[PDB]
Symmetry: D2
Subunit: 384 residues, 4 copies
């Protein structure tokens, strides 16, 4: 069965007692024993919960993994994976342009001696080769990257990692299982911040780690319980509900993004445009090869200054100025003051992040309405 | 004024837009800015959420702390504290009889070199002083302990700790802020598995860390966001709801526990009985001095064999055989088979845990109803 | 089992598939067939829902009835009963001082010829008898009444109504099953606005109709499904959750009320006091006879003009000025502008409701704290 | 603002206090006054609720109405409209083939004399016009009809209805606002069971009545509060969440429906097919003219007997045998034993409802997978 079928039906008719099509929400923190010294499949929600189990199976199926571990946030899924595979003295190799939260977590802990971290431009074969020569225990890959949507060869990185015996984990948040499948590309693990596209409705905060090896699933589950990062039952339910429309949401959002990309290619005030589909985007060839779609995330550089930017923004009404991405509603953010405000000004410029770069998480509103709304912003930027 | 008033009214009327008496559930994962580079008090749920903020204030207030950080599980509240206060090379002194999850966590990470752990009998003055001489960075106290309900001097232990420069954190789950206040006894932090008494309804899994120092709150908050362990908004809602009846719940449950002890004090089949109110109970006098009540948890050894055990249990119907405690419903567990089945039989015995020891988490059903139920249990225990 | 045991254990361990102690929330609107022409116990939520079934069982049991039908509001439970036992031509006899929503509903449909309504002072036997001679098909009793708390003889009225062939229904909202059981006093049915005391947490809106006769239950169930007033599954879950602490909630709210009553008796600014516990209170002897407690609701007339009352309310802090009652938090209401705002001053006065009468819905905050707050209001009232 | 833009953004950023993008869930049953006699927009949740308001505005906007009243069920929305526009002596003209629940409701109350009802074949000019000449106060239209998908001329019926002073209401559940807009076709009111397509996730039960005249919205709102059929806050939240994806869901469901129709037209075992897009389908010219799409509901008569039907259903695995429709998951039902089981076979026969008619509520799974499943059922229908 195709991904559209899996997303819609996985977990349906789970209820064996009442014949409910949609599974109930098992909020119970505990479960009675069948008899003395005879517990059932679950004995304590923190360790195992029936509702979390259903969504874990659905997410594992969508990525083609053996099983999944749902965590309470995407950041705790990242913390779970690093906790399991790294101890003081061990080395982690991560992308030089990875998610700000991820960088901050690794940096903060490595600065305490908890483990070693090496940030590398994984697109640079020489740089990458040298990092892997240091024999890391874990290699994190994140593609496309934010906010320039730069793409790196997942299959190649995972292979080189496997060559030196490092476990590979791919943060597939930006494209979701509907537009990219890292396990099918050679990764040992794939994780997501379910807070984004998977839930798709901006009202659930959760993370997940999916593994190709069932023994690794069990190890992850063991550690998730041990440090207490398993996800809640209610969030599990809403996440599963959001998942039901994952495919049509991703296809329409992507279709909308392509329409916006095409329109922006004609705009004079668009100094630079970024999207995996653009032949000139860093790693486009790779994207065309390893992705099932180019994605709904995009970004562009407005020609002008801070007031031109404030003018542009002030002219919008269908894009909400806010953090995050992946929801059904269109959002816009200014990297220099939002996603990368925690990055040194010189660094941002050093990272190729312009002070006038705006990133758009395309929603599923009508594409022409969204484009007409951008037209209004551009009209406003050009007025003095 | 009084804690009963705090639990009931904290958070009420928070709504300034619609005038709702009960605050709404703020599930939104993100928040809009008022203008470019002008965020509001909240920018991302994982970092800060309006509903979680409210329940944190209620919990802080209930323990007399400056602030609280709600985590997704009690275990992650313990992991958060250890993560903030220990780094490779630092030492943690924990109770030799602390909660199983706490023990397993500290042990598993200490084995990896993340930090050092020394498990000590904090009731053994000589043993305690020696460990503190190791100059730990953190000292964890957990009283009463489970399942023998032994009690230790929190005020003293915290004083000693502070002297050696160690930060003290007390796991107050067993009694809740309604029956004991560690901060009042000189602790730097008090934490609870809100999954227990605080929520009181067995349908929420959450943890919380409350600090005396506001600077410590800010730091615990930064780290909780960093490693991703902040609790959910929905759980925050149901938790605060459960909190509204904490005082009446604890009062009635304690009364029923006291009534059950009495009845048990006539059972030729009760080989031994444990409760902090009994004069022969380890640490009873300290208990009478630092606690506000003796608690709703109790346990007793069944004079007989496994067969005698299965029989007694088989004759109950108002006590559910299950893990956990703190809920309005009465539960019973067999440590050897549940709580401590992870210990070798001799190890359990060494720890003073009998193969026929039964723990009761007293609920708020009718006392007489509860005693009567036990009556039938014993009747069967006898029967050939 | 006693009330407290019923309220706490109803529904526990219902989950036979995963053994959840707390029943899961069955939100599913549809159920599958076990095969062709093979329905299940449930087929359509609007008709039958597993979570609604549980709470209906609990409520029927708390009032000692055969069964219950949970409706979406207290008003629709009232509308359901009238729809079932009245058609054009039939007569309904109701209390002259019944709930304002009940009055408005009966009046509004009577005005359209849907049925005839007769409002009588059921405390007046000849009047009561005269009305019963008209041969009503249904008689509604509501005791105590709002806001004066007048009490009438439920057993007597139900007795008289039964001999003329009228079905009796009692609105037991004000006292709840914990303080009064109309089915035992002779009624055919008892209904409540679960929105108040039963839920007790001001975050659920629902109603319930409980019948002595099982046949009447299937009747009410058929009609509730027919006109679509069945309660929702999520509300059913939050209501059952609230039900868990009904007994200690009523007990404590009741004690705080008596203490407050006692206090007001010593207040000069208190012109009149109203509480079933007071000998002088209308129907006091009947209350002491038919009630298991005198209730948590009370009202008093302030000695002074409007500015005096504003002053009094303005000095308060532990009572929220709002409609509704039955929550854990203490609420205060000015009948002339709130509960009875819709009623000419001539009608209000005629009905015996002062322009300075205040109603208190006692919560479970600390009693001393509550009185200390009233003292603040009084001090301000007499403050010039 | 196109419908996709409205469905996705209506109500977004409603929270002015915290700036939440997604509106929080207002469960609060009561609201405080900003002072004595200074109530707020909301004073009692059963009357007005902030979360119900948001979804009401969204539903109203999608149908182009002035406002909407959300009820607890689709049946109570139907009961609310008939309650407002009919009283004893008044006449209701309803579709001869309307929804079973609707028929039962009107029949049951007309039999008690609550009002008069006339079931007419609205596709027959003679019968339709003779009924309108009876001067009804209300005319209910339901197109397409279940389970044959017959379509009637809404603009024509509403035109003739207005001529005789009747109010027109259209039950637009089957197509939803995304595929049909009765107000734009001249109706006074449009109602829906939100339990179906609007919510689309089978975990909400709700109804809604949308009116073109703001004065009628007020009247319907007054009555909804009066008889207590207003929908719940939690349901309002989940329904709004479901609305977010209405357009892509209907589009895809419809697209799949067309692919299934095309396929079934090739099955020798399909002796009769029904779908509005079919040239020979009763009312096709009207459908093509008044609908924005032909819809996702379809039906067909299996060539064979009851054992054949059994074999066919048994061969399916992606279609759940269950009542209801409109969810993201594909469902199938056998009218004779499910939807119209309570219709004497003679009646079903006179109604053109075959004993082997199967209705399909097309979901959003991959269309090829669904077709393959169907082929499997057919290959099994042949093994006999
Ligand atoms: O005026 C007539 O004869 C019509 O027949 C009008 C009509 O059908 C419509 O407005 O749909």
């Amino acid at each position: 069965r195709k991904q559209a079928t899996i997303a819609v039906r996985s977990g349906l008719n789970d209820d064996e007692q009442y014949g409910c099509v949609v599974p109930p929400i098992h909020l119970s923190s505990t479960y009675n024993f069948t008899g003395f010294n005879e517990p059932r499949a679950h004995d304590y929600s923190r360790r195992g919960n029936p509702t979390r189990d259903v969504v874990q199976r659905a997410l594992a199926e969508l990525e083609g993994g053996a099983g999944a571990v749902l965590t309470n946030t995407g950041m705790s899924a990242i913390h779970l994976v690093t906790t399991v595979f790294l101890k003081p003295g061990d080395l982690l190799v991560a992308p030089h342009d990875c998610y700000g939260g991820s960088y901050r977590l690794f940096d903060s802990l490595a600065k305490r001696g908890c483990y070693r971290v090496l940030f590398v431009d994984q697109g640079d074969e020489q740089a990458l080769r040298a990092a892997l020569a240091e024999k890391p225990k874990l290699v994190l890959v994140e593609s496309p990257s934010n906010p320039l949507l730069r793409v790196v060869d997942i299959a190649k990185i995972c292979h080189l990692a496997r060559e030196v015996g490092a476990v590979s984990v791919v943060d597939n948040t930006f494209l979701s299982p509907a537009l990219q499948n890292p396990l099918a590309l050679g990764a040992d693990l794939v994780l997501h911040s379910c807070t984004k596209y998977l839930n798709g409705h901006s009202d659930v905060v959760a993370g997940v780690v999916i593994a190709k090896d069932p023994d690794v699933v069990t190890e992850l589950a063991w550690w998730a319980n041990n440090i207490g990062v398993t996800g809640g039952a209610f969030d599990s339910y809403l996440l599963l509900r959001g998942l039901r429309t994952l495919v049509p949401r991703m296809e329409l959002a992507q279709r909308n993004a392509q329409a916006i990309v095409k329109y922006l290619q004609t705009q004079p005030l668009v100094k630079k445009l970024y999207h995996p589909s653009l032949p000139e985007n860093q790693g486009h060839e790779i994207a065309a090869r390893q992705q099932k779609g180019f994605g709904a995330m995009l970004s562009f550089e407005l020609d002008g200054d801070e007031q031109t930017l404030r003018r542009f923004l002030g002219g919008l009404s269908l894009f909400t100025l806010a953090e995050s991405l992946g929801g059904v509603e269109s959002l816009i953010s200014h990297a220099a003051t939002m996603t990368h405000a925690g990055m040194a000004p010189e660094a941002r410029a050093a990272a190729g992040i312009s002070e006038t770069l705006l990133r758009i998480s395309t929603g599923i509103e009508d594409g022409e309405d969204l484009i007409a709304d951008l037209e209004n912003g551009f009209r406003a930027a050009n007025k003095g």
